[PDB]
Chains A and B, each alone.
Chain A
Amino acid sequence: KARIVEYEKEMEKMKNLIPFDQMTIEDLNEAFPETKLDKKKYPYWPHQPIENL
């Protein structure tokens, strides 16, 4: 039940994400932690493998 009241609270977050047209790259990171660049592994621009780019 704990692991469910969490998810339903988690899911409503991604159910109410700002329309992407108003979204900032600093907002896309708190929503999808998958997209935040690894400023620690790659300190210099473009902060990611050029192949991945």
Chain B
Amino acid sequence: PPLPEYGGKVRYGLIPEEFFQFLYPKTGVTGPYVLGTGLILYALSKEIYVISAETFTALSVLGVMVYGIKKYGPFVADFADKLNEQKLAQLEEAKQASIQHIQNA
């Protein structure tokens, strides 16, 4: 079977769009967003997510990750395609030739 052509349309690479549409009707556009700020400010206030040394090693490895994606994403995004539309063409080409070796024959 043929694969589809797109995934799940995820926003911020962390929360899928099936969530925003799920809460859009009753709570509106800014519904889920204010939940985020509502949970984060609650988490680090009641010391659920306690600020530690790991907080600043989190932001760094999240900063390098979000910058490596934005700077080297599109290059790998198409390079994974060119490996296919090469392997695809490399087949369709020989496929036609393999007819000449049987049409001439």
Q: Do chains A and B touch in the complex (CB under 8 A)?
A: yes
Query: Hey, which bits of chain A sit against chain B, CB under 8 A?
Result: 7, 10-11, 14-15, 17, 20-22, 32
Q: Which B residues contact A (CB, under 8 angstroms)?
A: 1-3, 88, 91-92, 94-95, 98-99, 102-103, 105
A-B contact count (CB 8 A): 22
Contact A11/B2 with A20-B91, A20-B92 known, Cβ cut-off 8 Å: no
Dominant secondary structure of chain B at its interface with chain A: helix
Interface of chain A: mostly helix, strand, loop or mixed? helix
Question: Would you call B102 and A14 a contact (CB within 8 A)?
Answer: yes
Pairwise interchain contact A14-B91, C-beta atoms closer than 8 A: no
- Known contacts A20-B88, A20-B91, A21-B2; decide if A32 and B105 are in contact (CB<8 Å): no
